[PDB]
Amino acid sequence: DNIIMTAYISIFVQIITAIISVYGLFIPLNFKDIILREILILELIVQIIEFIFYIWLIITLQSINEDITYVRYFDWVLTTPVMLLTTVYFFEYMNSDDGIRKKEINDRDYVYLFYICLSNFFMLLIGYLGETKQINKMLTLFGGSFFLFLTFYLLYVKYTKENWMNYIVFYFMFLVWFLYGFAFMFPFSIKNQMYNILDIVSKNIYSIFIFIVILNQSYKLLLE
């Protein structure tokens, strides 16, 4: 009952977040702030993949004859790299006194961003091998956690500055992603309830956060 229930809740919050996000795209910004729009567009692309998974889940859960948790990885392998890119864009936005856009960041940092996504890919591959019972759960937790910590280390040392704004965003995101590893430990029903709620936080709450930053910047523009 509780997987299907939390899946419907997720889908509700997905639809509300998509509405807020699309409105966000239209809100007037200074040219130096337009990377926030670039971020919201990528978050909406993520939402397309998330939605297809959640519709598949609610339809499929009617009649299930195996642990289908592994199917989430077909979503994660596409969405998590995009989410790491939008995190980099936000930190660069936050920490750049000068206007910066994704083209300039992508062109300059291509190699480093590739390695962030490669670390993240190895995390997911180890998780997938664990989820499909090809390696034991302890080895999965250790190997997956190693690559999670490597991904966030790479993010930290290149893209953070030493102030409260940076610590708050970085460490909240880190905790949320860590809890996907925590969830891995749990039996099928509890694990999938946890993933259903975590997706709301990692994906949808991030989009709403970006929307709020856009609202704040647009108001400054209106007032000036």
Numbering used by the authors: 2 to 225
Kindly provide excerpts from the paper associated with this entry.
Phylogenetic analysis shows that, within the rhodopsin superfamily, viral rhodopsins form a monophyletic family that consists of two distinct groups, VR1 and VR2. Here we present the results of a comprehensive structure-function study of two homologous proteins (61% sequence similarity) from the VR1 group, OLPVR1 (ADX06642.1), and VirChR1 (TARA-146-SRF-0.22-3-C376786_1). In this work, we demonstrate that VR1 rhodopsins are Na+/K+ selective light-gated ion channels that are inhibited by divalent cations. VirChR1s have proteorhodopsin-like architecture with short extracellular loops and share several structural features, such as membrane-associated ICL2 helix and an unconventional TM6-TM7 orientation.
